[PDB]
């Protein structure tokens, strides 16, 4: 009984910790990359919008 | 090196490559004897869940022919895997008729630029005509 319960508990602990370390890492990487890409995108949006009116009135 | 090398991923890639080659019938082993080749292939199969040992199996029984193809295929797979993240770095596969491709390749070799660059120049000249029509 001790052997079986210890084996099951160790299996549970190892699977849980490894799966969490496997997934949460890429999850946080995705979150950070998305935030950085949004921050970069806003500048292009603003500059494009300014050039839009500039060339709309320049003609 | 521009792309990070991940050991536990490339090892699995290499193992899958070996298994695919073998099941296709090619002689991945360097052994001419049937028995040793069969034993080495069986050991590689056992190595399915231990990609780390695949490097040692490669150094121990890999056919000397396949090193160049190995270093080519896994390198290309790494590039593609890292490029697949974003659309703007992906590649698109298209098929071209022989006359069209012949003309396009001759033009590209004339201008000394890649096919995508030549297509860019052509479509950009067309778009310049369109732009000046629009103004």
């Amino acid at each position: 009984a001790i052997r079986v319960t210890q084996s099951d508990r160790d299996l549970f602990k190892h699977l849980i910790t490894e799966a969490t370390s496997y997934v949460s890492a890429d999850y946080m990487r995705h979150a950070n990359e998305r935030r950085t890409h949004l921050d970069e995108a806003l500048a292009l949006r603003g500059e494009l919008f300014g050039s839009h009116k500039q060339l709309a009135t320049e003609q | 090196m521009k792309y990070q090398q991940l050991e536990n991923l490339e090892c699995g890639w290499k193992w899958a490559y070996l298994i695919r080659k073998h099941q296709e019938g090619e002689p991945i082993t360097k052994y001419i004897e049937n028995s040793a080749a069969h034993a080495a292939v069986d050991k590689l199969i056992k190595l399915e869940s231990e990609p780390v040992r695949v490097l040692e199996w490669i150094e121990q029984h890999m056919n000397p022919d396949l090193f160049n193809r190995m270093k080519q295929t896994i390198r290309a797979r790494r590039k593609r895997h890292f490029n697949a993240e974003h659309q703007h770095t992906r590649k698109k596969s298209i098929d071209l008729d022989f006359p069209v491709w012949h003309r396009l390749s001759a033009l590209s070799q004339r201008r000394g630029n890649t096919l995508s660059e030549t297509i860019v120049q052509l479509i950009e000249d067309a778009e310049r005509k369109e732009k000046y029509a629009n103004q």
């Binding site: 699977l15 799966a19 969490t20 950070n32 990359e33 | -």
Partner: protein, 98 residues
Amino acid sequence: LAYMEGGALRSMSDKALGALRLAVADNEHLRDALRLSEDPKRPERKVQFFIAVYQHLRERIRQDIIRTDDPVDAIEQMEIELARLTEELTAREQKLAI
């Protein structure tokens, strides 16, 4: 991990995948799900595999008393049972010696 950089997270995920390769060899369908979780075009697959793992550990619960289905919760009950069985084992060894 929010402080870490892309390379560190990628390496950590690589190590975790290396561990899961050994931890999963016995299972067939969960192993297949892990293999499919490798695609970079479909990151959601990862989470699916994660759920599968839980959906596995949920069924590995032994008896009614261990039905804290949340696997992170049954660990404490298992350890309690281990302590109880340890004291019981000491008593049984004493009995056998006499």
